Structure formats: structure tokens, C-alpha cells
Amino acid sequence: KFPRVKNWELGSITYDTLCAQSQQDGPCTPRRCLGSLVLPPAEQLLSQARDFINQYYSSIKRSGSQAHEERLQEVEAEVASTGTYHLRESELVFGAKQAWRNAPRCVGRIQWGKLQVFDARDCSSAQEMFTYICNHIKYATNRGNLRSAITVFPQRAPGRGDFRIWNSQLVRYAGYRQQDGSVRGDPANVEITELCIQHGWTPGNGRFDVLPLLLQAPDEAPELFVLPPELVLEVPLEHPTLEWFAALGLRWYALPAVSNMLLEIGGLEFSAAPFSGWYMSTEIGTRNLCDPSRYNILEDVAVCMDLDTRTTSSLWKDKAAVEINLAVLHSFQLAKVTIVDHHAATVSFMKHLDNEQKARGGCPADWAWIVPPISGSLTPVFHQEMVNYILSPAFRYQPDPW
Amino acid sequence: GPKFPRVKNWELGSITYDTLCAQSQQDGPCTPRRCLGSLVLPPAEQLLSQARDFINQYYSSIKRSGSQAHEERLQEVEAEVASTGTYHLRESELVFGAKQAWRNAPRCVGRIQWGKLQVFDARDCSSAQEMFTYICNHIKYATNRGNLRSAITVFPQRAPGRGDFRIWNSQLVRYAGYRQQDGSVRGDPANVEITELCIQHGWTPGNGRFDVLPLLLQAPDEAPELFVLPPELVLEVPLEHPTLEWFAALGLRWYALPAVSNMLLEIGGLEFSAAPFSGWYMSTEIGTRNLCDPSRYNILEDVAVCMDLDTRTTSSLWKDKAAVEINLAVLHSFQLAKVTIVDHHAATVSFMKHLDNEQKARGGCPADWAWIVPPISGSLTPVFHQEMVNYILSPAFRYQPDPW
Numbered sequence: 001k002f003p004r005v006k007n008w009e010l011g012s013i014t015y016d017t018l019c020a021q022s023q024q025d026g027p028c029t030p031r032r033c034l035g036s037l038v039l040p041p042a043e044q045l046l047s048q049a050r051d052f053i054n055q056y057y058s059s060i061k062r063s064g065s066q067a068h069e070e071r072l073q074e075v076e077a078e079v080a081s082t083g084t085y086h087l088r089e090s091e092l093v094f095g096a097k098q099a100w101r102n103a104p105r106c107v108g109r110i111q112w113g114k115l116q117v118f119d120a121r122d123c124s125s126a127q128e129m130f131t132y133i134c135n136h137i138k139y140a141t142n143r144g145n146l147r148s149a150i151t152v153f154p155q156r157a158p159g160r161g162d163f164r165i166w167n168s169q170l171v172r173y174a175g176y177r178q179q180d181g182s183v184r185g186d187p188a189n190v191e192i193t194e195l196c197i198q199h200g201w202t203p204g205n206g207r208f209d210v211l212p213l214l215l216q217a218p219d220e221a222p223e224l225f226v227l228p229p230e231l232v233l234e235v236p237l238e239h240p241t242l243e244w245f246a247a248l249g250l251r252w253y254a255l256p257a258v259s260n261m262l263l264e265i266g267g268l269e270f271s272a273a274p275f276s277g278w279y280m281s282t283e284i285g286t287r288n289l290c291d292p293s294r295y296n297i298l299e300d301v302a303v304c305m306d307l308d309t310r311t312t313s314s315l316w317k318d319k320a321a322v323e324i325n326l327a328v329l330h331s332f333q334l335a336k337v338t339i340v341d342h343h344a345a346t347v348s349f350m351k352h353l354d355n356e357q358k359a360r361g362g363c364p365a366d367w368a369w370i371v372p373p374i375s376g377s378l379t380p381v382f383h384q385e386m387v388n389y390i391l392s393p394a395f396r397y398q399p400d401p402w
Numbered sequence: 403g404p405k406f407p408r409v410k411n412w413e414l415g416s417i418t419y420d421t422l423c424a425q426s427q428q429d430g431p432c433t434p435r436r437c438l439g440s441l442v443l444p445p446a447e448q449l450l451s452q453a454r455d456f457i458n459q460y461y462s463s464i465k466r467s468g469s470q471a472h473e474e475r476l477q478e479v480e481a482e483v484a485s486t487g488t489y490h491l492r493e494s495e496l497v498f499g500a501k502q503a504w505r506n507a508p509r510c511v512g513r514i515q516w517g518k519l520q521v522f523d524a525r526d527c528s529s530a531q532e533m534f535t536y537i538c539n540h541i542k543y544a545t546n547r548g549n550l551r552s553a554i555t556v557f558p559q560r561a562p563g564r565g566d567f568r569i570w571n572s573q574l575v576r577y578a579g580y581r582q583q584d585g586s587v588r589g590d591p592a593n594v595e596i597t598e599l600c601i602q603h604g605w606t607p608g609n610g611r612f613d614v615l616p617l618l619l620q621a622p623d624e625a626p627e628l629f630v631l632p633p634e635l636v637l638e639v640p641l642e643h644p645t646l647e648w649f650a651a652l653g654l655r656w657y658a659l660p661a662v663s664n665m666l667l668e669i670g671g672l673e674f675s676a677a678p679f680s681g682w683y684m685s686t687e688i689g690t691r692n693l694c695d696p697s698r699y700n701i702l703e704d705v706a707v708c709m710d711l712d713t714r715t716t717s718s719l720w721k722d723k724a725a726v727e728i729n730l731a732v733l734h735s736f737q738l739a740k741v742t743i744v745d746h747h748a749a750t751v752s753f754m755k756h757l758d759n760e761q762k763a764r765g766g767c768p769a770d771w772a773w774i775v776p777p778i779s780g781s782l783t784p785v786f787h788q789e790m791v792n793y794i795l796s797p798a799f800r801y802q803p804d805p806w
């Protein structure tokens with residue numbers, strides 16, 4: 001019934017009672033488990049809405065109370081006649097905060113408290129959209145002292161199409177299908193960089209060409225928006241001892257800002273709702289820089305480091321992975337830019353567990369994404385049992401708009 | 403699309419559908435509401451169908467399926483059970499049965515080698531001295547002077563009321579963990595309880611950091627004898643780092659043979675309460691879990707000191723560097739001792755082959771991602787980008803209670 005979740009490094013044993021709050025079901029069944037997998041009426045909305053409203057006022061003192069009284073009524077009315085309602089600004093600030101907290105893949109959750117919710121539900125043109133982006137980005141970068149934030153664009157309509165950001169991050173490097181099967185720059189970004197060309201933009205042949213923004217208002221042809229260079233803040237990557245590293249001319253950006261997700265709240269749905277925290281050095285070091293399907297620079301730096309590619313058993317792959325990571329870490333502390341090493345980050349998540357285990361008795365987590373891509377067993381999380389289940393409001397993946 | 407689960411490989415873009423799981427006549431702990439994939443652990447009428455099952459499988463391996471040899475051996479197992487509530491496997495199907503459970507084990511990257519497991523029936527066994535000798539033979543054979551061969555030895559099954567056979571020791575080789583009375587431990591803290599249980603039995607403990615535990619062996623009911631192992635028979639490997647000189651000075655060593663001994667092999671309903679299996683090590687096992695887990699031997703702290711590293715802060719990345727070096731140290735010393743070993747990249751590359759095989763053969767391979775993917779260099783290995791499906795199949799290894 002209620003699950004025993006033990007930490008193995010410390011013999012400590014808890015129970016998750018928070019699961020029962022999950023409405024939405026996942027992939028696992030009694031027969032076989034699919035934890036590893038990356039992805040997947042009228043009156044019914046009134047119930048999601050409802051259950052979100054109880055959540056809300058229990059959040060503030062006013063639980064099951066006296067404005068919780070008639071507020072549950074404005075909704076009664078507004079779906080009753082028009083089959084969809086709108087959120088009060090305070091209520092939306094709650095939904096964002098909550099939905100991050102609710103996301104079992106996010107190791108940066110200790111922070112869910114502090115978050116800046118820009119409101120754009122008054123956005124009509126894609127022009128206005130752009131402005132909001134630059135402003136989200138300005139507030140969020142904060143000259144290098146990064147601040148977690150989420151601009152929220154209009155909630156999709158029963159009738160019409162959607163506001164959608166086509167980009168899968170506000171900042172990104174172009175990916176350029178050369179002529180020889182070859183790829184120049186970020187390969188995870190080819191199919192997309194093609195769409196900007198297709199919607200008529202001047203490309204480069206740069207490794208770290210920052211891409212422009214393709215924003216789309218409902219039932220309208222996507223518009224392109226070249227992003228004022230000054231907002232995108234990037235870091236050259238050097239190395240505390242290897243003199244030769246910055247020869248390589250590797251750079252990364254500061255702001256990780258997801259844009260292709262779907263903010264689901266109180267039953268309503270936000271197709272654009274970009275959000276941006278701050279990076280964990282391994283995202284930049286290990287995946288971003290080393291994934292084969294990406295920039296894939298492991299071998300390069302390994303040869304530099306005069307190591308031995310010839311065989312796997314010389315650990316050359318692990319040896320480089322650690323410098324590159326170590327390089328990524330340095331760089332930010334050099335350039336006065338917020339960064340979080342895996343160790344430091346997982347330690348605090350550990351905290352967040354307990355911390356929530358208190359507040360709400362449990363907390364959903366996707367172990368495989370919670371544990372770092374290098375040196376896993378060397379973080380605590382690796383030794384902590386986790387329980388993963390779906391909790392509204394939360395972020396949800398959505399099919400690309402083309 | 404198919405009525406089965408889609409399995410993508412995010413590095414190569416490839417897909418396959420796992421249809422083996424259709425045959426999981428056993429339940430796991432994940433349910434549509436919540437997933438418990440991370441949790442380390444979560445006979446009258448039935449005993450028939452379980453064998454009914456296993457036999458079908460047998461007669462498939464031989465591809466003499468549906469035939470009269472089939473139905474005759476089917477009409478024989480009932481004969482026997484129907485009359486006595488139990489049956490015995492022919493020796494040929496024990497050999498099959500054993501390999502199938504290994505092949506089935508969702509947590510073993512080793513499985514590329516599944517068909518090369520070499521089985522010693524010891525179902526004739528009856529005392530405990532007997533147990534110890536059979537076991538020696540095993541080690542003897544399987545160590546094979548460092549050029550190591552996978553092997554299992556099977557001891558007589560469970561019964562209606564009649565003491566199980568049981569090996570108390572978890573592996574056939576695990577170093578003593580002596581609790582100092584200053585709070586700490588000396589040696590492997592994994593094995594405290596067992597080291598305790600051995601002095602409590604008349605072994606006189608040593609006082610080093612790497613003393614090989616004596617072997618605790620139970621026969622049916624007769625409360626368990628305590629046997630020691632011939633020092634020449636337990637191939638140890640002392641550890642040096644190839645470039646860094648002072649490592650050998652750390653006094654670290656490891657044993658060659660990883661011999662799981664406390665598990666249960668289950669086939670056709672029948673339960674084999676003591677039936678240990680050995681393979682060979684994968685660098686990380688030793689060089690990350692064993693030597694570095696804070697719960698364990700925990701050397702990371704000292705090694706970084708020796709590496710002149712800044713341990714005051716984590717942004718220095720000392721854990722990772724020290725770990726990499728310790729592993730490089732594990733691989734070098736086995737390599738140089740001419741003692742079978744396998745690096746993590748090389749272990750996974752090969753799991754990925756096994757998956758491509760098992761797809762052709764059974765249509766699916768069950769796996770614990772959290773357990774398949776190595777404890778360092780996670781993503782650096784192909785498996786990491788491999789969606790997997792976990793599920794229970796029989797024959798199977800089960801975890802079992804500590805006997806006390």
C-alpha cells in the first residue's frame with residue numbers, strides 16, 4: 001500500500017503517503033516496469049480545477065475556508081457557461097512554483113520556493129511575445145547572478161490553436177548539415193536550424209552560432225526574432241592547469257531556459273511558458289559537450305591530454321570527462337556566473353527530500369534522471385531509494401508544432 | 403503501432419518492441435499510479451503449472467517441441483508430483499535451467515556469456531564436509547589460475563519440512579570486518595555481522611584489513627559447520643597504479659573470484675537454497691563500490707590526499723579524479739597479474755551486443771537500467787542511452803533471507 005523507501009548509505013527508512021495524491025497514471029504495470037522510458041470531458045475539467053483550488057487555499061492559511069468559499073464559485077460559473085476559466089495572478093504564481101516542485105526529474109528542487117513568475121497572459125502578437133522573452137532573459141540572467149524564473153504566455157483554447165515557442169530553449173547553438181554527412185555546431189539542433197533558414201535567416205558556419213527565436217501566436221505563420229547579442233551571456237572555457245584548453249575555443253551560455261514544455265495547471269494548459277534556472281556543471285561538461293549525438297569532443301581533449309585512445313581499459317574516456325567538467329566548473333567561477341557542481345547539487349537535493357518528506361510526506365523522483373551522468377555512485381542520491389508518480393500541477397512534454 | 407512497449411536507443415535512434423515480457427508469469431512492484439524501479443528489493447496446485455511451464459521451455463531449447471518425448475516427460479513430472487507433491491529435474495535440464503536463470507537476471511551485464519556457464523551438479527550432496535569439498539572444487543576450477551571460468555554448483559533443493567541447505571556467507575570470498583570498540587571498523591564493513599557470526603562459532607579472527615572470512619556451511623537441520631580455505635586456493639591480487647608510485651604503498655588488494663553464494667536458483671517450482679555462481683569482476687565493482695562507497699572500505703578520502711588534491715571543496719572535483727585513478731589502479735593490477743577482468747566501457751559495449759542478440763532470439767531482454775549502467779562514467783557508456791524494460795522470468799535468481 002504505502003511504500004518503504006530506504007536510504008542504503010545510512011540505513012534510514014521512510015514511507016511515501018504522497019503517492020495517493022496522484023490522479024494521472026504512468027507507464028509501469030505490475031507485470032513489467034518502464035521507468036527508464038524517456039516519454040509516454042466537460043465536468044472533468046471542473047474537478048481538476050476544483051482540486052487545484054483546494055490546494056491553493058490550503059497553501060495560504062485560508063484552507064477550506066471563506067474566500068475558498070466563493071472562489072470555487074467563480075469557477076463553478078466560468079466552466080459552467082463557457083467551458084473554460086482563467087486564473088487569478090496569485091493563483092498562477094502558485095501553479096508555477098508548485099509545478100516545478102512537482103517535477104520528479106528536476107534535481108534543482110531545493111529552490112522551488114524562490115521563483116519569479118512573469119505574467120504574459122495579456123499577449124496578442126508574437127511581437128509582444130519576443131519582448132517578454134528578452135525581459136525574462138534580462139531579469140533571469142541578472143548580470144551573472146542568475147535567478148530562477150518563468151514567463152507565462154496565454155492558455156491554449158478549446159477553439160483556436162496555440163501560442164508556441166518553436167525553440168526548445170531560448171538559447172541554443174546552430175547545427176549545420178554540411179555536405180559530407182558532417183555536422184558543424186550543435187547536432188541536437190539541426191532540424192531546427194533548418195527551419196530558421198526556411199523562414200529566411202542569415203546562418204553562419206560558426207560552432208557556437210546563437211540561434212534566433214521562432215515564436216508563433218495562434219493559427220499564424222511562425223515569426224523569426226534575432227536576439228540582441230547582449231542578453232545572451234556566454235562563458236569561454238578554460239582550465240585551472242592545462243594551458244592548452246582555451247585554444248580549443250569552447251564556449252557555453254549561462255541561461256538554461258526550457259521553452260518547449262507545457263505548463264499544465266488546475267486543469268488549464270500553457271503551451272508557451274519558458275522557464276530558466278541555472279546549470280549543473282555536468283549538463284555542460286558531460287552531455288552537452290561529450291554525447292556522441294552532440295559536440296562529442298571527448299577524443300579531441302583526450303589526445304591533447306596525451307592519453308591512450310587505443311583501448312577502453314586506459315580509462316581515457318573517464319579521464320577527459322572529468323577535465324572537461326572541471327573546466328566547465330572553473331570557467332563560471334572565473335566569469336562570475338552561477339553554476340552548480342553535481343556533488344554540491346545532489347547534497348542539497350538530499351536535503352529537499354527530508355525537507356519535503358516533512359512538509360508533504362514524500363516527493364516524487366525519477367532516480368535515473370536524478371543521478372548524475374558521471375560519477376553517480378559518488379553522489380548520495382545514487383544510494384537513496386526514490387518513488388516516481390505524476391503530480392498536478394506539473395510540466396508536461398508536448399509534440400513539436402510542425 | 404504494436405500492443406507492446408516501444409524501446410528506443412537515444413544514441414542511434416533505433417527502436418524495438420519487447421514482447422518477451424508477455425511471458426512474465428510473475429509480478430513486480432511498479433503500478434500504473436507509482437513506479438518503484440529504484441527499490442533494491444521490493445505448494446500443491448501451482449507447483450505443477452510452474453514445471454509444466456519450465457518443461458515447455460526445455461523442449462524448446464532442444465527444438466523437439468510438442469513431440470511425444472515432450473508429453474511423456476510432461477506425463478512424468480505430474481506422475482511424480484501428483485503422487486508426492488514434488489519432482490526432480492533431469493540433469494540435462496538443470497544445465498539448461500541454470501543458464502536460463504542467469505540469462506533471465508535483469509541486473510547482470512555479464513549476460514553476453516550466458517551460454518558459456520559451466521554447471522556442476524552436486525545434488526547428490528548430503529553432509530556439510532561434502533558441501534565444502536564440492537565448493538573447493540568449484541573455486542579450484544573457476545579460478546583456474548587467473549584465466550577465469552564462469553561456474554555454478556547446485557546443492558539439493560528444498561523439501562516439505564526438512565532443513566534447507568544453506569551457505570551463510572554471502573559471497574564465497576569476503577574479507578573480515580572487525581568492529582573496533584572506538585566506533586570504527588577494520589576491513590570490509592559489509593561483513594560485520596558475518597564476521598561476528600564466525601567468532602561466535604569458534605573461528606579465531608585475524609587482525610589485518612584483508613583477512614579472508616572462514617566459510618559457514620549448513621546442512622539440513624544440522625546447525626552449521628565452519629570451514630577454512632587453503633590460502634593457495636584463493637587467488638588475491640595486490641593493487642598498484644601504473645604511473646602513480648605510492649599506490650602500491652596504500653596496501654590495497656582484492657580477490658579474484660566474485661562468488662555469489664546466498665542467492666536462490668529457482669526452476670520449474672523447485673527451489674535450490676544453496677547453489678553459488680562465480681564469474682569474473684568488472685573494474686568498477688571493486689574500484690568504486692567496494693573501495694569507495696562510504697559505507698564500505700572508503701579510500702577516496704585518503705587517495706585524494708595522496709593526489710595532492712583540494713578536498714576542502716567539491717568544485718575541485720576531487721572525488722571523481724581519485725575514483726578514476728582507483729579504477730585505473732584496479733584494471734592495471736589485474737591486467738598485470740594476468741587475471742580476467744573487464745572495464746566498464748568494454749562490459750557495456752558487450753551488453754549492447756547481448757541485447758541485439760536477445761532481440762533476435764526471445765524478442766526482448768529484461769533489464770535494470772539503475773543496475774546495468776555503471777557507477778562512474780554513466781553516460782559515457784552506450785547502455786545509458788538505452789531505454790530498458792524490467793520484468794521477472796523463471797528460471798530466476800531470487801534474493802533470500804539471511805538464515806538466522
Ligand code: HEM
Binds near residue numbers: 105106108275345
Ligand atoms: C535552480 C537550479 C536548478 C537546477 C540545479 C536544475 C537542474 C536540473 C537538472 C540537472 C535537470 C536534469 C536535466 C537533464 O537531465 O537534462 C533538471 C530537470 C528539470 N528541471 Fe531543473 N534545475 C534548476 C532549475 C529549474 C527550474 C526553475 C525549473 C522550473 C521552472 C526546473 C524544472 C525542471 C524540469 C521541468 C525538469 C525536467 C524537464 C524535462 O525532462 O525536459 N528546474 N533540472
Ligand code: HEM
Binds near residue numbers: 504511519554684799
Ligand atoms: C562474466 C562475468 C560477469 C560479469 C562481468 C558480471 C557483472 C555483474 C554486475 C556488475 C552485477 C551488478 C553487481 C552490483 O552492482 O551490485 C551483476 C549482478 C548479477 N549477476 Fe553478474 N556478471 C558476470 C557473471 C555472472 C554470472 C556467471 C552469473 C551467474 C551465473 C551472474 C549473475 C548475476 C545475478 C543473478 C546478479 C543479480 C543478483 C543480485 O541482485 O545481486 N553474473 N553481474
Ligand SMILES: Cc1cc(N)nc(CCc2cncc(CCc3cc(C)cc(N)n3)c2)c1
Binds near residue numbers: 038039168256275
Ligand atoms: C530535446 C529533448 C527531448 C526530450 N525528450 N527531453 C528533453 C529534456 C532533457 C533536456 C535536454 N537538454 C537540456 C535540458 C535542460 C534541463 C534544465 C532546465 C533548467 C531550468 C535548468 C537546468 N540546469 N537544466 C533538458 C529535451
Ligand SMILES: Cc1cc(N)nc(CCc2cncc(CCc3cc(C)cc(N)n3)c2)c1
Binds near residue numbers: 679680681683687
Ligand atoms: C540486499 C541485496 C539484494 C541483492 N539483490 N543483492 C545484494 C548484493 C549486491 C552485490 C554486492 N556485491 C557483489 C554482488 C555480486 C556481483 C557480481 C556477481 C557475479 C556473479 C559476477 C560479477 N562480476 N559480479 C552483488 C544485496
Ligand SMILES: C[C@H](O)[C@H](O)[C@H]1CNc2nc(N)[nH]c(=O)c2N1
Binds near residue numbers: 036037369370373
Ligand atoms: C535512456 C535514459 O533513460 C536517458 O538517456 C536518461 C537517463 N538519465 C538521464 N539523466 C539525466 N541527468 N538527464 C537525462 O536526460 C537522462 N536521460
Ligand SMILES: C[C@H](O)[C@H](O)[C@H]1CNc2nc(N)[nH]c(=O)c2N1
Binds near residue numbers: 440772
Ligand atoms: C538507491 C539505488 O537503487 C541503489 O543504491 C542501487 C542503485 N544502483 C545499483 N546498481 C548496481 N549495479 N548495484 C547496486 O548495488 C546498486 N544500488
Ligand SMILES: [Zn+2]
Binds near residue numbers: 028432439
Ligand atoms: Zn517502474
